[PDB]
Amino acid sequence: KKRKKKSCTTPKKNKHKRKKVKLAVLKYYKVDENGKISRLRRECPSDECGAGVFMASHFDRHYCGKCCLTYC
Amino acid sequence: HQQLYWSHPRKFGQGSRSCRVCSNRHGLIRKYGLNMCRQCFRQYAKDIGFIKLD
Amino acid sequence: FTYRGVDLDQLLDMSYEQLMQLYSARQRRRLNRGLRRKQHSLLKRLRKAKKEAPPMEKPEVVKTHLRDMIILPEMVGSMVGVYNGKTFNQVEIKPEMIGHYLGEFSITYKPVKHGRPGIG
Amino acid sequence: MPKKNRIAIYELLFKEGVMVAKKDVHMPKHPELADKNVPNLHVMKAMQSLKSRGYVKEQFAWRHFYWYLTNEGIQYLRDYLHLPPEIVPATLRRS
Amino acid sequence: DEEAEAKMLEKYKQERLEEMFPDEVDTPRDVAARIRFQKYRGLKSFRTSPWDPKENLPQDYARIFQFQNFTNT
RNA sequence: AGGAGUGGAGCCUGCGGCUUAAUUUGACUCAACACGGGAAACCUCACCCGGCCCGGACACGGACAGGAUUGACAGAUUGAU
Ligand SMILES: [Zn+2]
Ligand SMILES: [Zn+2]
Questions:
Q1: Is the dihedral of CA D76, D77, D78, D80 positive or negative?
Q2: Domain span including residue B52
């Protein structure tokens, strides 16, 4: 008593969700039974994220996640 | 929201100074480097040594 | 049409440090201190609305908060909408307002018509 | 807050047992912990986390925050950063 | 049988929204207030207000019988 | 008994009324009305229109390293890298 429930909460301002495929390293790696390491995506030439941290490959560009470097 | 929120230039003006004990921005005594409110100066005046003579 | 004795066509290719000698002192000093980072991106938006506009059609209305934007002579004809605190009001840029601010064309208040006086 | 912030705030707590602040969320970095780039908001909210558990003891002032360390808070830093008791903080140094 | 029990458990509750709240309804968020509560009116005093007793007769009231004075008849 | 006036005039600033999306507000005889040290461009800022953020300690249950939030170029969307 001494209130009304008022049912006036509207939080419908949807945020994102982190869609990760199951072990996205399989999206990153592809190895044949002889033992070849085929990195299917580009490697960023930055000093902080060189030789281990892989880029993105979009429909028209390359793209980093650490320093967000971009190509064509 | 990094080049944002505390972004606006507070390099002068009324709302870049606040009292040093109230953290309030109105009625401020900047003279001689006091930087107190006009109300909080009157509480701590005899501690600072400002005696009321005449 | 002219402005301080020079037509608009020479104003379209009048350079940055030479157009400044035609303006009044607020606008000349404003172009001396520079146009900032969020004011270069408005003129780029008006270029992007101009060269994609049809050749017989004025460009679409574009919404701004930049009431301090000086009306440059390379900004004539555009449909900008400068805010008034409540709404974005539609502004069409004519060549005779090329030394004013953008924020003196959305009025910020309702021009007052009085009623009957109450208890004074 | 990342690991190199939350760890590095706890490091100088065990060294002398006290920590001061400013109640200044908007400060770029805490002045005692230079060369780390930890903001004052980070150390402020870290000690707000530590006070509700009971490891520190809060006291305020004109504008600054003050924090001492309780007896059950010394052990919470002793196992979080793995120190032996053969070394001592500034408790038993003079007299 | 259980759908009326679903009506039964809420009737132990929608009744109980009346013995603690008199007529606490929810205001309409979608439709305008001059549309949802168009038909109503506000009385200045519930007992001493004027009210025309034959302002909006329904079509069922053209199917009933009247009296000139019930006690004296 | 006088002197300077105020009340008339222009303007500056308070306070009501009207106006408004908002024209934030307290104070109404002396004992409210150039008072809140209150001369507000932004900040101050409470008010209005729109948008971002958590800076929701800690305790408990779930998600839980076939992950939880996080950060980010371009394009559209936007006042707005
Ligand atoms: Zn990296
Ligand atoms: Zn003060």
A1: positive
A2: 1-54
